[PDB]
């Protein structure tokens, strides 16, 4: 069935699973034509496929070339997403395939289901959670590689950097989702927070600053403040 508040801990048990987010696969800028009409220009996109237990991000970049000559691009996007996830599963050894794939938007179930008919023992599941993976394009390194890409390409990052060495996957997933929620509610503030102290560097192979445990607490608090705050300035409360 669906993943929600009540069955939240299943993400961190020992059954392999993947979150698929498709919100950044088909991206456009909307602009005006010489005749004063409106047209779109597609820019590179990505699929966000995340093992919440290990932190692994299988980033498939979606090069604007894949749309050339195609119609109904928002609908193709979902199927293209599904085609790519099924390819990734097929590419993986059997003991490394997920037992579940959880899609963050319901419109991805039928495409993924159809593309995974060859894997009847992989459960395709929606969720009731309002997860913030759309903001993954606010992470500089992530955004950079997508926009620089000149051809289709699969990029790998641990979205948890080295956190698992010190904290559990539950705690790491909560940090990630709080970081991503902040970035989605006010990207500027969120980033000002993350970088205010020039002495905390981001390692070449990491996406996030090298905070100490105690610096993470402070950070995590400031992010909560932000999300509440903006919820005020968004609801005048």
């Amino acid at each position: 069935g669906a993943m929600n508040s009540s069955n939240y801990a299943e993400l961190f048990n020992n059954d392999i699973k993947l979150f698929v987010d498709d919100t950044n696969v088909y991206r456009v800028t909307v602009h005006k034509t010489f005749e004063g009409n409106v047209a779109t220009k597609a820019i590179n996109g990505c699929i966000f496929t995340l093992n919440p237990k290990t932190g692994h991000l299988f980033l498939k970049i979606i090069h604007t070339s894949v749309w050339a000559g195609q119609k109904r691009l928002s609908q193709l996007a979902k199927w293209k997403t599904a085609e790519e996830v099924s390819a990734l599963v097929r590419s993986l050894p059997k003991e490394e395939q997920p037992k579940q794939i959880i899609v963050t938007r319901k419109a991805m179930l039928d495409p993924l289901e159809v593309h995974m008919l060859d894997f009847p023992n992989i459960a395709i599941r929606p969720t009731e959670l309002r997860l913030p993976f759309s903001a993954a394009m606010s992470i500089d390194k992530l955004s950079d590689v997508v926009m620089k890409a000149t051809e289709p390409q699969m990029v790998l990052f641990n979205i948890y950097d080295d956190w698992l060495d010190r904290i559990s996957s539950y705690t790491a997933f909560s940090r990630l989702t709080l970081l991503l929620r902040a970035l989605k509610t006010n990207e500027e503030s969120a980033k000002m927070i993350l970088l205010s102290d020039p002495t905390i560097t981001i390692k070449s192979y990491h996406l996030w600053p090298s905070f100490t445990d105690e610096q993470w607490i402070t950070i995590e608090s400031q992010m909560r403040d932000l999300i509440l705050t903006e919820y005020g300035r968004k609801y005048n409360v």
């Binding site: 193709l76 199927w79 599904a82 039928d110 495409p111 289901e113 159809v114 593309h115 008919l117």
Partner: peptide, 13 residues
């Protein structure tokens, strides 16, 4: 409608 009988490999959509 969601069966291999119904769906050719490569023509999924």
């Amino acid at each position: 409608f969601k069966s291999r009988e119904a769906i050719r490999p490569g023509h999924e959509m």
